[PDB]
Each structure stands twice: as C-alpha cells, then as structure tokens.
Paper text:
The SpChiD substrate-binding cleft contains four tryptophan residues (Trp114, Trp160, Trp290 and Trp395) with Trp160 and Trp290 flanking the entrance and Trp114 and Trp395 situated in the catalytic groove of the binding pocket. Half of the space in the SpChiD substrate-binding cleft is occupied by a loop (Asn30–Asp42), and the front face is equipped with Val35 and Thr36, which may provide favorable chemical interactions with the incoming substrate. Phylogenetic analysis of 131 bacterial family-18 chitinases revealed that all the SpChiD-like single-domain chitinases from the Enterobacteriaceae clustered in a distinct group. The novel loop and tryptophan residues were highly conserved in 18 of these enzymes, confirming their divergence from other groups. Therefore, Trp residues at the substrate-binding cleft appear to increase the affinity of substrate binding, thus influencing the TG activity of SpChiD. Mutational analysis also confirmed that Trp114, Trp160 and Trp290 are necessary for TG, and that Trp114 and Trp160 are the most important. The proportion of DP1 produced by SpChiD after 72 h was 96.4%, whereas the mutants V35G, V35F, T36G and T36F produced 54.8%, 96%, 51.4% and 59.5%, respectively. These data suggested the importance of residues Tyr28, Val35, Thr36 and the entire loop in chitobiase activity of SpChiD. SpChiD is active against polymeric substrates, which may depend on the flexible nature of the Asn30-Asp42 loop at the binding cleft. The ability of SpChiD to bind DP2 may favor chitobiase activity over TG activity, whereas perturbations in the positioning or binding of DP2 for chitobiase activity may increase the number of available DP2 molecules at the SpChiD substrate-binding cleft and thus increase TG activity. Further, we conclude that the substrate-binding cleft of a chitinase like SpChiD regulates multiple activities, and could therefore play a similar vital role in the 17 other chitinases present in the same phylogenetic cluster.
Author numbering: 18 to 415
The structure:
C-alpha cells in the first residue's frame, strides 16, 4: 500500500582524481536530480615514503584531511546548491584511487583520534551533512599503490566505530567499497562495520581489465565472454558477493559509471593465472593495432597509460565522431551498450563499453527488484547535460 523511496548518490570529481583527471566545474551540476552529493576528494596528510604530493608530506598535519584550494572554493558554494535543492545532502568524500594515508591514519588510537578530529573540523567549517570514506583499499593497498597491512581490516572497523561515536547525531557516515570478491572476504569486515554506516556505496564498475571486455555489465556477456575466471565480473555478481557476506540489500547503493573504459584486452595480453606457465601462455591477445591505438591517442586517450573515457566524451567524440568510425551496439545479456570500430580487414573490434540512459534505467529496475537502497554514480562531471542523472532520478522516483 505504499511506494519505496530510493537514494541517488552522485560523486563529483571537483578536486581532481588519479584516473579521472582534473576537477570539473561544480556549477554545471543539476543538484535537483540527486538526493546526496559526494564532493570528491579530501586527501590525507601522510608519512608514506612514496607520496609524491608534497603538500601531503607536511609532518605538522599528519593524519588530518587536506583540502586543496579548489576544494575549499567549491565547498563555499554549498549555500547556492542547497537553495537549488533544499532536500540535498552534501558529504565530503575522503580518499579515492591512489589516495594514501588511510593505513597510517587507522593504525593507532592516537592516529585515529587526529583523523576524527579533522573530520569533525571540516564538517563544521564547511557545514557538511557527513563524511564518505573511499579507501582503495584496506589490506590490499590496490596492489601496492598505497601502503597497507593486514591489520587494516580490523583498524578500519575501529576507525568507523570511533568516527560513528564522534559524529554529531544525524550526520552521515558512508563508505565506498570495491568490486573485487576479496573485498568482503578479506579486506573489509562488512558485517562488523554495517551498524556504523548509513549506507554503503558499491563500486560496481572498473571491470574492463584482464580478459574481460565490459566495464559495468549488469550480468555476464555471452557474445563477448570473459575468458579467465578471476576476471569474470558483473554488477550482479558483486552485489551477490556482498549479500553473501551478510549485508542487507537496503543498506547498499549500486554504483553506476558515467564513463566507459577501453578494455585492457584490446591492448595487452590476457593472462589466466589458473593456467600452466600462465605468463607465457596468454589466453587472450590484443586486437588493437597501431591503427586503433592512434585513433584514441588523437582524442587524448593514451592507452599505454589509461583507458577512462567520460560519458560526455563518449557521446561527443565517439558516437558523434565526424568520420563515423564507431558503431553503437547493445549487449542484451549484459544490459549495457558498447561501441565497435572496424579493423582494416573489416572486422568489428570491441572498443569500449559504458552506460547510456537505457542501461541506467535497467540498473534502476535491478535496484527496485533486488530491494537495494539506491544508486550511486561516478561521477557527475562526466554526465552529458545531466542526462544520466536525470534518467536515474526518473527511474527511481527521486
């Protein structure tokens, strides 16, 4: 006898991001289409020896939050955003891909207390509704990209318990978590931290690695199948792995990518580490030649360094390429769009998968049928005239 209520939590890369690039213009965003805005990112002053941002190496601020000048300027504009949407909640997200400092911040009673005091200071100075922690990743360290240790799992739980205790009542505490099956298994005690969190943002994207073609497929593709088992991911598979770990669906937001990736399979041999003499016997081989890589390079995407392509750029540069080099397709099993480019020999080559309005609506339908709490998306600056956010708002009744 009543309808559901859903979240739509939009990350916004305002300060700049390691993989997504320099920050966007906050003034472009339509904040009426979202329930929550995760302004990204605050960073962490840290003593990691490999830290290359010298601002973060200030020893007098160790374990506190760093806000760049652009982040501080953008956060000044919150009163304007709140007037636009009086129901909007605004959090600062701390961390992001490659962001150092969480392992050390979490490590001791003393370090945690410094970090928590800094969270409290920032929330009060900028009048935030809460804080989102995007630690990529406890225990795993993103495969050595940031410092990590096995104690990170338990220390993250302590940090969240203590931060929950320190936050004013009514403030929000949220986190983002990885797609990798090891995240709920080994990196993060999801069951243990659930009582401290308002909701959990699932990073159900960045799957176009190894032998997998699709970046954010809802279900596995059959036409374009992943070869190695350890690479075989889908948004639904990730959701089920988190549900198996004992999270309730209503606490979860399904992450949706407002971007695509050229699969690594296009340019790098795909290794199945479950095979004999694996590194010498790749199970997939690159199908881009210099011809294809040059097309992407000319558009500003150097595939030797990165594969990220914003949705707005997919629309302007790929779909609407004046030379008509890219053909749009739909994968009915995966429930997402993808583009092909024609090889010199005439064969369609899988160039990139992404999300469009139809696929965003299908992920909203999944949210509704699975009883998830809502959607999250990365990130609003990559939308095309706020269209994907609008589709999500419409589909979820925001």
């Amino acid at each position: 006898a009543h309808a559901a209520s859903y979240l739509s939590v939009g990350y916004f890369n305002g300060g700049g991001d390691v993989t997504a690039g320099p920050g966007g213009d906050i003034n472009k965003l339509d904040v009426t289409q979202i329930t929550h805005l995760n302004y990204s990112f605050g960073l962490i002053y840290n003593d990691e020896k490999q830290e290359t941002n010298p601002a973060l190496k200030d020893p007098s601020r160790l374990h506190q939050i760093y806000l760049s000048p652009k982040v501080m300027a953008d956060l000044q504009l919150l009163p304007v955003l709140r007037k636009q949407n009086p129901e909007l909640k605004v959090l600062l997200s701390v961390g992001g891909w490659g962001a150092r400092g969480f392992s050390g911040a979490a490590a001791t009673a003393e370090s945690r207390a410094v970090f928590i005091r800094s969270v409290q200071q920032v929330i009060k100075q900028y009048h935030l509704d809460g804080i989102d922690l995007d630690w990529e990743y406890p225990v795993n360290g993103a495969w050595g990209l940031v410092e990590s240790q096995p104690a990170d799992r338990a220390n993250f739980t302590l940090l969240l318990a203590e931060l929950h205790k320190a936050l004013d009542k009514g403030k929000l505490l949220t986190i983002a978590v990885g797609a990798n099956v090891k995240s709920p298994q080994e990196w993060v005690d999801v069951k243990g931290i659930a009582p401290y969190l308002d909701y959990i943002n699932l990073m159900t994207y960045d799957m176009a690695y190894g032998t997998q073609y699709f970046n954010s497929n809802l279900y596995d593709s059959k036409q374009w199948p992943t070869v190695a088992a350890a690479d075989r991911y889908s948004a639904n598979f990730v959701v089920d792995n988190y549900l198996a770990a004992g999270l309730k669906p209503a606490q979860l937001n399904l992450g949706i990518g407002f971007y695509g990736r050229v699969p690594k399979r296009a340019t790098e041999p795909g290794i199945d580490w479950d095979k004999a003499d694996a590194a010498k016997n790749p199970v997939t081989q690159p199908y881009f030649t210099a011809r294809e890589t040059a097309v992407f390079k000319a558009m500003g995407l150097d595939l030797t360094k990165d594969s990220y392509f914003k949705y707005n750029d997919i629309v302007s540069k790929l779909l609407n390429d004046p030379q008509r080099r890219f053909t749009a397709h739909w994968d009915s099993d995966a429930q997402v769009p993808y583009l092909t480019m024609k090889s010199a020999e005439g064969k369609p080559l899988f160039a990139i998968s992404y999300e469009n309005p139809r696929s965003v609506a299908l992920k909203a339908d999944y949210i509704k049928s699975k009883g998830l709490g809502g959607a999250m998306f990365w990130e609003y600056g990559a939308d095309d005239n706020n269209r994907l956010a609008h589709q999500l708002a419409e589909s979820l009744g925001i």
